[PDB]
């Protein structure tokens, strides 16, 4: 129950339920907006439209499909089916689908930078940034070295999106120059002279 698409492509998710219902409803959940009702279809309907969403209902073998056209990054979320009986006492969620929508990076510029040491910290901190969305950041393979996953950052002031990951350690043999080498590094990664 995990679906990963590129921004702009279609997303189709399915769900099934076990009992008779009055209606079925799809929900979206993320930390950006919480758990949100998307669309409601009655057991006597077969298909419904609302914006970029269309839901199908096949009561015959108790299944529903949700299709999102022209997916955007914001659609990244968990999707769940809830079924409900008249009166509200049996509104029940079923198995969910996790949807990841990768945003396109128009101006990639992959680079590894060393940040300035903090006077209040013993850590050295490295930044891998501006790589395109095809790059995956591998976790740390050493005990006292920490590497985050990628985070997509929107500089709305410049209409500029960029990916980045952070690595750090207080060990004396840690080096920004190879901190991210357990990843597949784009051949055009910039390692500026300090």
């Amino acid at each position: 129950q995990a679906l990963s698409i590129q921004e702009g492509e279609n997303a189709t998710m399915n769900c099934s339920y076990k009992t008779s219902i009055n209606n079925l409803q799809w929900y979206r959940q993320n930390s950006g907006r919480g758990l949100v009702h998307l669309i409601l279809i009655r057991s006597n309907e077969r298909e419904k439209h609302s914006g970029r969403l269309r839901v199908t209902l096949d009561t015959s073998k108790k299944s529903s499909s949700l299709l999102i056209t022209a997916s955007r990054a914001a659609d990244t979320a968990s999707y769940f089916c809830a079924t409900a009986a008249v009166g509200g006492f049996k509104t029940i969620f079923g198995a969910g689908t996790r949807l990841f929508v990768k945003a396109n990076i128009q101006n990639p510029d992959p680079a590894v930078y060393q940040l300035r040491d903090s006077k209040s910290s013993d850590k050295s901190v490295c930044l891998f940034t501006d790589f395109d969305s095809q790059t995956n950041v591998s976790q740390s393979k050493d005990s006292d070295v920490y590497i985050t996953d990628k985070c997509v950052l929107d500089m709305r002031s410049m209409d500029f999106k960029s990916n980045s990951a952070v690595a750090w350690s207080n060990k004396s043999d840690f080096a920004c120059a190879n901190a991210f080498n357990n990843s597949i590094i784009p051949e055009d990664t910039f390692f500026p002279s300090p």
Partner: protein
């Protein structure tokens, strides 16, 4: 955000504390709900309250003692919880209508609850801010600051950036998930990073002050503390860097 008002967003408790989860809506809705959700699972229905009737789907309802003083409130009264009760607790309401067909549900923000067996494992974060790379500035005319919050337990932090006294969201990316500092231990402490990226011109001004502040949710005043180290209460932990001229 939402018209279903649920507090608190985060809660850490021991096995002997008593605490209420508040849920309120003023939409005139006629059914209210509690669900719980364990990580990577669907919400599981606990309670419904509608037209004077509490419906119970929870196996241990005495731990949660729901109460509705009126149709606008459905509060949970927590007592004698176990660590396995750690979950996201979600309140909702539904209008129903006049013949009960309008069963769509509106959710509140949820309470992320951790029940800790040993309160001596609770630790607030250390917070540090790291200044942008001069090489990034030279190559991109942009400047990425990094904030690290480390060593905290359990995982209930809210990180924000404050520039010259006002909170900033534009140009910020905070990790969706924390790192376990020791991924092979059940009680590992956590780390979280955040980036703030600004134009180089904004960073290269010594009068601009950049603060990373982390709200940690920990022990409350009704939690007993007998250790020598400082009580790990709910608290803000801050770090700050000033801009640096070219």
């Amino acid at each position: 955000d939402t018209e279903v008002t649920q507090t608190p967003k985060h809660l850490v408790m021991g096995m002997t504390n008593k605490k209420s989860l508040k849920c309120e809506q003023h939409m005139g809705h006629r059914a209210m709900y509690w669900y719980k959700q364990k990580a990577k699972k669907p919400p599981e229905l606990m309670f419904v309250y509608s037209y004077e009737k509490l419906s119970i789907n929870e196996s241990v309802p005495s731990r949660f003692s729901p109460e509705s003083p009126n149709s606008s409130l459905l509060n949970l009264h927590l007592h004698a919880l176990q660590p396995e009760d750690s979950a996201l607790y979600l309140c909702a309401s539904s209008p129903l209508g006049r013949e009960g067909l309008n069963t769509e549900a509106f959710f509140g923000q949820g309470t992320r609850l951790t029940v800790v067996e040993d309160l001596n494992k609770v630790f607030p974060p250390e917070v540090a801010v790291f200044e942008p790379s001069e090489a990034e500035i030279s190559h991109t005319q942009k400047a990425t600051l990094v904030c690290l919050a480390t060593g905290f337990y359990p995982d209930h932090v809210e990180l924000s950036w404050w520039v010259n006294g006002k909170e900033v969201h534009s140009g910020v990316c905070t990790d969706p998930q924390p790192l376990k500092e020791q991924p092979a231990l059940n009680d590992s402490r956590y780390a979280l990073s955040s980036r703030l990226r600004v134009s180089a011109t904004f960073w290269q001004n010594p009068r601009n002050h950049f603060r990373c502040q982390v709200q940690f949710y920990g022990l409350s005043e009704n939690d007993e503390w007998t250790q020598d180290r400082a009580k790990p209460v709910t608290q803000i932990v801050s770090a700050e860097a000033w801009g640096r001229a070219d």
